[PDB]
């Protein structure tokens, strides 16, 4: 959060959800730092690239998050478009 003098006087910014664009509190323990890996284009082996996703707790406890993982992966390109 910016002031008029031009400093980041806010002490920290929290993470935002990647499925509903909601905020994650400091005491919401039902969040995930999801890590998915890619493969090489010529051999399908491990490379070292990550794509981090975050899911808030209400999306878990409300009933569906795997479909949101599919939409995130199709937007990223891991899951193919034909499905």
């Amino acid at each position: 959060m910016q002031n008029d003098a031009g400093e980041f006087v806010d002490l920290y910014v929290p993470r935002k959800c990647s499925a509903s664009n909601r905020i994650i509190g400091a005491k919401d323990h039902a969040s995930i730092q999801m890590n998915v890996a890619e493969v090489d284009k010529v051999t399908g082996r491990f490379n070292g690239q990550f794509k981090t996703y975050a899911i808030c707790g209400a999306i878990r406890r409300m009933g569906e998050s795997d479909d949101s993982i599919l939409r995130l992966a199709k937007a990223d390109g891991i899951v193919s478009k034909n499905f």
């Binding site: 959800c17 509903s20 664009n21 909601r22 209400a58 999306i59 409300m62």
Partner: protein
């Protein structure tokens, strides 16, 4: 029966915002709904939206974005002066640093911020933040 299409539509999009849905369906249509959502569109609260125009009162499909807290509507349409606008947003908006309230200016449907610098006012519609 149905007596205010704007209140019902705005309650529906509020319920779907609380429910985490991505796209909605408003059953009736009017001009004032289109102008109210395009004020939100120009203010960046809501991204894409669509209109399904048949040969009757059409339907509106809105592509929502997770930047919305709550949208409200005031019934009946109260009279707002230029000296009463700050009195309304002091006890209606959650803060003075953000949040917008719109009203029926004689020149278009438009928010209070530009209405402060155009020296005009009229009947009220609602708020969003």
């Amino acid at each position: 029966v149905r007596m205010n299409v704007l209140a019902d539509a705005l309650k529906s999009i509020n319920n779907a915002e609380k429910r985490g849905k991505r796209q909605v369906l408003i059953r009736p249509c009017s001009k004032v709904i289109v102008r109210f959502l395009t004020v939100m569109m120009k203010h960046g609260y809501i991204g894409e939206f669509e209109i399904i125009d048949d040969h009757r009162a059409g339907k509106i499909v809105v592509n929502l974005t997770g930047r919305l807290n709550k949208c409200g509507v005031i019934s009946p349409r109260f009279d707002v002066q230029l000296k009463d606008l700050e009195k309304w947003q002091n006890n209606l908006l959650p803060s003075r640093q953000f949040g917008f309230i719109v009203l029926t200016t004689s020149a278009g449907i438009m928010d209070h911020e530009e209405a402060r610098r155009k020296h005009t006012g009229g009947k009220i519609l609602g708020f969003f933040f």
